[PDB]
Design brief:
Organism: Sus scrofa
Number of strands: 0
Number of helices: 1
PDB class: transcription
Radius of gyration: 23 Å
Keywords: RNA polymerase II, de novo initiation, transcription
Name: DNA-directed RNA polymerase subunit beta
Distance between the termini: 40 Å
Entry title: RNA polymerase II core initially transcribing complex with an ordered RNA of 8 nt
Shape: elongated
DNA sequence: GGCCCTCGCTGTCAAAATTGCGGCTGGGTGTGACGCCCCCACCCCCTTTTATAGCCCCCCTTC
């Protein structure tokens, strides 16, 4: 697709059924500089 | 004093059972939630009356 040259090997290509899973990167990304702390431990809380 | 045996006691090794402890790292959703029996104060209803009226039980009457 970039240079327009033929690929020397011959790619195996065809229609295949794919599924998108609920495991999505926007539901998983998580960061924390400084936030709320626990009532008992005074340590950072559990989970995003 | 010295040789030889059986015996009782504390003791020991061994077998057997009894018991405190452990069981990966981390992450993301969601969902939901005492009683028994007695004793002691205090209050309500028992009764009388009446006005008042809607409601309802009881007995009578109809066919």
């Amino acid at each position: 697709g970039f240079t327009g040259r033929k690929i020397t090997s011959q790619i195996f290509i065809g229609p295949t059924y794919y599924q998108r899973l609920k495991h999505m990167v926007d539901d998983k990304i998580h960061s924390r500089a400084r936030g709320p702390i626990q009532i008992l431990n005074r340590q950072p809380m559990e989970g995003r």
